[PDB]
Design a protein around this ligand. Structure first.
Ligand SMILES: O=c1cc[nH]c(=O)[nH]1
Length: 234
């Protein structure tokens, strides 16, 4: 049930203070659905059509942010037509306006941030930025004892120029590890373990910057991000 004060909408649109927006509203320069509204506190709804001096002012719907626990078998973009996208799990209006601020392959599960705020998104996904992500990785074979050092110094991916930035590995079981990287190269985690002689069997993302996947969010479930999560992702 999105809505907002008519004075805040006008201040937003004209680039003025709320106090000056109120002056204009009282000055009979603002119309809603064709009728003059002189009340700065008028509750503006999405269906309303606002005009300033006769000029239509389309309503720019606020930005939305969601936390999704991505399941296997679905993809994070319409690039590939052979598999259904994660929008299948979202029950929101004009959901097609949403994109993943950091995509995950078809059988990788975990934290995906869905949003329609392009600036917020780029800040997180830019290849020039340092944003940490943590994954829970299941391997085909017991991790080699020099792999942590390897990842700490950086490894070279098959046919890539530069080494991977330092990454920290924590062993949970011999075939299950937690890995934190600050990059976003294509299929980086799988290629990193391949380079050192192992094979990723399962991959689950637990964190991105200051946002961690809720322990009780089941695969396929999602929720709006809190005001705090939005203001502190990275
Ligand atoms: O970060 C990574 C690495 C490999 N594959 C993914 O889906 N994500």
């Amino acid at each position: 049930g999105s809505h907002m004060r008519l004075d805040k909408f006008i201040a937003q649109q004209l680039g003025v203070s709320r106090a000056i927006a109120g002056r204009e509203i009282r000055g009979n320069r603002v119309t809603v659905d064709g009728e003059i509204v002189r009340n700065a506190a008028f509750k503006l709804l999405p269906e309303h059509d606002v005009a300033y001096d006769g000029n239509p002012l389309a309503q720019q719907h606020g930005p939305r942010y969601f936390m999704l626990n991505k399941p296997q078998g679905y993809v994070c973009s319409t690039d590939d037509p052979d598999h259904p996208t994660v929008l299948y799990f979202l029950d929101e209006p004009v959901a097609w306006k949403l994109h993943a601020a950091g995509r995950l392959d078809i059988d990788t599960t975990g934290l995906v941030l869905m949003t329609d705020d392009g600036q917020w998104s780029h800040r997180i996904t830019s290849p020039r930025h340092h944003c940490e992500k943590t994954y829970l990785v299941t391997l085909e074979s017991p991790v080699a004892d020099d792999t942590a050092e390897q990842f700490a110094k950086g490894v070279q991916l098959h046919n890539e120029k530069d080494l991977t930035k330092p990454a920290v590995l924590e062993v949970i079981t011999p075939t299950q590890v937690r890995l934190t990287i600050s990059e976003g190269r294509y299929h980086q985690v799988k290629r990193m373990f391949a380079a050192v002689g192992n094979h990723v069997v399962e991959l689950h993302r637990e964190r991105i910057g200051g946002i961690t996947l809720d322990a009780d969010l089941a695969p396929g479930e999602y929720r709006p991000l809190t005001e705090e999560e939005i203001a502190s992702v990275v």
